[PDB]
Amino acid sequence: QIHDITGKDCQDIANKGAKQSGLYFIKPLKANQQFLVYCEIDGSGNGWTVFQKRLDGSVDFKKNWIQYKEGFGHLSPTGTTEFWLGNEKIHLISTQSAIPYALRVELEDWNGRTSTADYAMFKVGPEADKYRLTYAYFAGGDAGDAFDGFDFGDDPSDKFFTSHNGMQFSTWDNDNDKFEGNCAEQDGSGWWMNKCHAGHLNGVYYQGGTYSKASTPNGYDNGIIWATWKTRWYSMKKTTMKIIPFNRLTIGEGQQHHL
Numbered sequence: 610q611i612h613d614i615t616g617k618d619c620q621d622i623a624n625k626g627a628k629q630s631g632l633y634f635i636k637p638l639k640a641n642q643q644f645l646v647y648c649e650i651d652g653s654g655n656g657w658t659v660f661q662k663r664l665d666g667s668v669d670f671k672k673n674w675i676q677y678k679e680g681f682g683h684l685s686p687t688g689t690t691e692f693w694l695g696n697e698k699i700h701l702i703s704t705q706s707a708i709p710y711a712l713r714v715e716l717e718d719w720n721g722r723t724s725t726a727d728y729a730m731f732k733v734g735p736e737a738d739k740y741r742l743t744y745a746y747f748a749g750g751d752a753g754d755a756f757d758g759f760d761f762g763d764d765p766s767d768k769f770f771t772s773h774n775g776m777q778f779s780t781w782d783n784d785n786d787k788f789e790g791n792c793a794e795q796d797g798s799g800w801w802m803n804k805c806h807a808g809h810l811n812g813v814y815y816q817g818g819t820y821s822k823a824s825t826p827n828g829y830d831n832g833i834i835w836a837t838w839k840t841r842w843y844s845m846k847k848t849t850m851k852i853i854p855f856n857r858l859t860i861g862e863g864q865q866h867h868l
């Protein structure tokens with residue numbers, strides 16, 4: 610069930626010798642708190658600290674501010690359960706030191722195809738700044754950069770309206786988006802909402818992927834979307850949000866060799 614190796618994060622645990630993905634306790638620097646996390650450890654010696662997972666629609670994501678702060682769902686040795694680690698814990702890990710983390714969003718469609726999108730220098734701010742999302746730049750990935758916003762065509766300024774960098778977190782009971790209405794209440798989730806969204810992984814789990822305006826009384830595009838990879842009417846089958854020290858991603862042809 611729970612492994613004995615501990616560290617500041619899952620990469621620290623992998624560096625110590627851990628070989629199996631599973632449950633481990635981590636103690637982020639300066640927090641004086643220890644908590645369980647699911648580490649995804651591969652053959653390359655990479656250790657990903659997973660903070661979000663969707664795969665079967667078993668966990669209700671319409672939770673309030675406090676629940677999104679503390680975490681909900683379940684952690685399993687097999688990594689086959691849905692959960693949200695908790696905004697407070699995500700903040701503690703991503704800001705524990707001066708070493709930057711990279712966020713990898715892993716997506717899987719209903720046909721078994723998967724894609725990724727990486728963001729460098731990912732951080733989640735303190736509760737005082739409503740767990741604001743900030744990143745330096747999109748680092749690559751075939752899923753596309755939905756966090757930069759997307760032009761759905763229903764407005765020239767769609768891109769500026771759907772960007773996520775710099776947005777505070779919102780829950781139905783703590784609206785911090787840039788919409789006159791309540792993005793979180795309308796979709797029924799917690800997320801870094803703007804004048805809503807281009808990438809939204811905490812949405813409603815729609816079986817089969819395809820859904821439409823007809824699916825909900827008011828016609829909201831509230832599924833698990835990533836506009837740069839699939840249409841807004843296509844909800845993902847699985848999603849994973851996981852972090853790793855950024856230096857782990859610049860280990861290959863991500864460098865200039867000189868002479």
Ligand SMILES: [Ca+2]
Nearest residue numbers: 788789790791
């Ligand atoms: Ca609002």
